[PDB]
Amino acid sequence: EKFAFQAEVNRMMKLIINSLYKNKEIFLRELISNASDALDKIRLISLTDENALAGNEELTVKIKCDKEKNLLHVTDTGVGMTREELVKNLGTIAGTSEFLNKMTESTSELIGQFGVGFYSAFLVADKVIVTSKHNNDTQHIWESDSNEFSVIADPRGNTLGRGTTITLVLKEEASDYLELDTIKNLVKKYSQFINFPIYVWSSKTKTVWDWELMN
Known part of the structure; x- marks a missing residue:
């Protein structure tokens, strides 16, 4: 059950962390981008498979603060990952060498272009759960x-239907990303041009809670 990160992933985590410590908010942009790609997938x-969406029939991103x-949760109803793809897609890396040299020598935008921005979650989080x-x-x-x-294996069974939740146990200094209005604010900036509904679990007024559409 325990696994080691591949060597190049450990370097990538260090490069990402020590070059973007001044722009920490970018992690939420990369989680929304990753959620969108999984919905696209x-x-x-579903274009070629009649039963693709049977485990869950919506195509959304839902964002929830605790x-x-x-805790901060980002849940999408995209393709999801098998147990083997969790091990490989999150612990290894399939031109990577070229591109850790491209970052050592803004780094904000080209981690987006390689699809490795998942690791920016460690800028704001002590633990990451997928x-x-x-x-x-x-x-x-x-x-x-x-x-x-x-x-x-999740002992709760299939509570997602289909898709992925990223859970971040945030560092003490990252508690600003628990505040409901900063989250709504960053979700707006980074979801304006995502082609799936994106919701934040928010409060309105007696205080009541429901999904509030963001895009």
């Missing part, structure tokens, strides 16, 4: 504090 698959547990349900597997949980990771 399942939508393409200030009392110190819960994922793919059509060809059971729900699994991937968990890491960057020093190792483990993949386990």
